[PDB]
Paper text:
Inhibiting the catalytic activity of 3CLpro has been proven to be an effective strategy to block coronavirus replication. In this study, we have identified mutations in SARS-CoV-2 3CLpro that confer resistance to WU-04. To understand how these mutations affect the WU-04 sensitivity and the catalytic activity of 3CLpro, we solved the crystal structures of these mutants and aligned them with the crystal structure of the WT 3CLpro.
In the crystal structure of the M49K mutant, three regions around the substrate-binding pocket show conformational changes in comparison with the structure of the WT 3CLpro. One is the short helix (residues 45–51) in which the M49K mutation is located. The electron density of this helix in the crystal structure of the M49K mutant is so weak that its structure cannot be modeled, indicating that the M49K mutation destabilizes this short helix. The other two regions are the loop (residues 167–171) after M165 and the linker (residues 187–196) connecting domains II and III of 3CLpro. Both show slight conformational changes upon introducing the M49K mutation. Particularly, this mutation destabilizes the short helix of 3CLpro containing residues 45–51, resulting in alterations to the conformation of the WU-04-binding pocket and thereby explaining the resistance to WU-04. Crystallographic analysis indicates that the M49K mutation destabilizes the WU-04-binding pocket, impacting the binding of WU-04 more significantly than the binding of 3CLpro substrates. We purified the WT 3CLpro and the WU-04-resistant mutants and measured their inhibition by WU-04 using a fluorescence-based enzyme assay. The S301P mutant showed a significantly decreased dimerization ability (Kd = 17.81 ± 7.32 nM) compared to the WT 3CLpro (Kd = 0.94 ± 0.21 nM). In contrast, mutations M49K and M165V did not inhibit 3CLpro dimerization. In our cell-based assay that was designed to evaluate the self-cleavage efficiency of 3CLpro, the M49K mutation resulted in a nearly 20-fold increase in the IC50 of WU-04 but had negligible effect on the efficacy of ensitrelvir.
Author numbering:
A (entry chain A), B (entry chain A): 1 to 45, 51 to 301
The structure:
């Protein structure tokens, strides 16, 4: 019983975190095999990064793994990440993949400062390709990930804070999520929407944990529900979403379109002072997978 | 910027988690130096635990650390925990302490099944000595902890789920938090209250992150505020609480008793459709320390 924002255990990622310094800029890097990955903006002091990097040498990069200095033997740029080749392969490299996630999907963030892990939390990639993280100065290069069996799938590297306080970054190939750039501009998050399939997943989590007051005998049609979704700035629900919710629908015996009728009622009338899983708002940062992982 | 429920990095605890089996009961143990700690109820099949343990031998305990079987060479009971002496000291033992926490304090939980860590999240010890965790069958023996510098302070070991779905357990000396027992009874959580100092800390976090709509020019007296606290089932605010909130008050320039006037207004009128740090409820599971750790 219970339902919490739950991160993956962070140990396998902790052993990959290092400190990268170039000039007076210090941030975090990810050390896998004999390569350290970090945001290329570490070499800034607008910019032409190819020019900036041509003017650097291996010795301009100080990489510290705990108390051990790692000698940089090569440097290159891949999109918005820097790859520093070091003379030592990380003995704690986990089995890993570089994956790009989709908006609506969740991942764990290991927030890090000066190469030292500080905390772990769960984030969702928002429809507008920002994340609502918790980052302070020095956190660039912190990574996001999911773990399956023994394999770490890295999906996010932190690069910047946008004016509204939300966060933007890249996949581990250095390609930004969303229409953001690692230079100084007036860039801002675009309009966002609520992740409908996740809200439904969380309502199923609530039912599994004994919250039933929002249930009703009605069922709606997919088309009728999607009219309501559009009105309340919710993402369209697809037949694939309905299919993905199948197992949760079966376990609870509440058909997906039956739960959609509950969600319509909640959107049109609110909660009348009640709560669901300890929240007075509809929660959209749990995927169906997240619910199945913790509720079963 | 941002404010998340954030756990400590769990790696140092992951390397201490083992599987303990006795009979047909499997649960988790904590392996520090050459001792494995686990709930004594693993030896159950009402009970007289001293009798149950006299009837056991070392060979009745199977301890598995990943793929390695650890040979049990001694067994004893300490309050509600079992101490299994094994022939191998854990090479990954961190610097650690066994500390008992107070209601209102927070800690990270490494939820574990079959000795395998599954996820990490933050919990608070409720005033009624339960925690609102996320645990499924098999999670007994999962631990709660805080980390300071390199030192793991273990404060909680999971033993049971109470009828309302909240959770009860012991410190690592085997002494229960709260009026709960590791036998079959109709025991239930007592009445709870809201942790006032934590609500105020979270309001300061909100101000630091730019939420100001609940602020006002008024200040209240400690006595007048505590009259309102009692009416809304909030814990009394003490001068020590005011002192602990000092640094956050200074950083924001909002005196504690000024923020107390905001909290009084919020309790008496609600939020009028607005939110604070993404919540439509007053959040009480962040301590002043938690706020200072993530906001600074």
């Amino acid at each position: 019983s219970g339902f919490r924002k739950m991160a993956f255990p962070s140990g396998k990622v902790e052993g990959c975190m290092v400190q990268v310094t170039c000039g007076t800029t210090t941030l975090n890097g990810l050390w896998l095999d004999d390569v350290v990955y970090c945001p290329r903006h570490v070499i800034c002091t607008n910019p032409n990064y190819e020019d900036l990097l041509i003017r650097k040498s291996n010795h301009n990069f100080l990489v510290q793994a705990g108390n051990v200095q790692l000698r940089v033997i090569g440097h290159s740029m891949q999109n918005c990440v820097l790859k520093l080749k070091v003379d030592t392969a990380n003995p704690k490299t986990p089995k890993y993949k570089f994956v790009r996630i989709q908006p609506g999907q969740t991942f764990s963030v290991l927030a890090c400062y000066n190469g030292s892990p500080s905390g772990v939390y769960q984030c969702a990639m928002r429809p507008n390709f920002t994340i609502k993280g918790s980052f302070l100065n020095g956190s660039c290069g912190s990574v996001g990930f999911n773990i399956d069996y023994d394999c770490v799938s890295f999906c996010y590297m932190h690069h910047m804070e946008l004016p509204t306080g939300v966060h933007a970054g890249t996949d581990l190939e250095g390609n930004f999520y969303g229409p953001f750039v690692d230079r100084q501009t007036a860039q801002a998050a675009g309009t966002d929407t609520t992740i409908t399939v996740n809200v439904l997943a969380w309502l199923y989590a609530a039912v599994i944990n004994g919250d039933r007051w929002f249930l009703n005998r009605f069922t709606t049609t997919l088309n009728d529900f999607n009219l309501v979704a559009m009105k309340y700035n919710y993402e369209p629900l697809t037949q694939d979403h309905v299919d993905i919710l199948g197992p949760l629908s079966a376990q609870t015996g509440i058909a997906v379109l039956d739960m959609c009728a509950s969600l319509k009622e909640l959107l049109q009338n609110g909660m009348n002072g009640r709560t669901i899983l300890g929240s007075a708002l509809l929660e959209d940062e749990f995927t169906p997978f997240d619910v199945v992982r913790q509720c079963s």
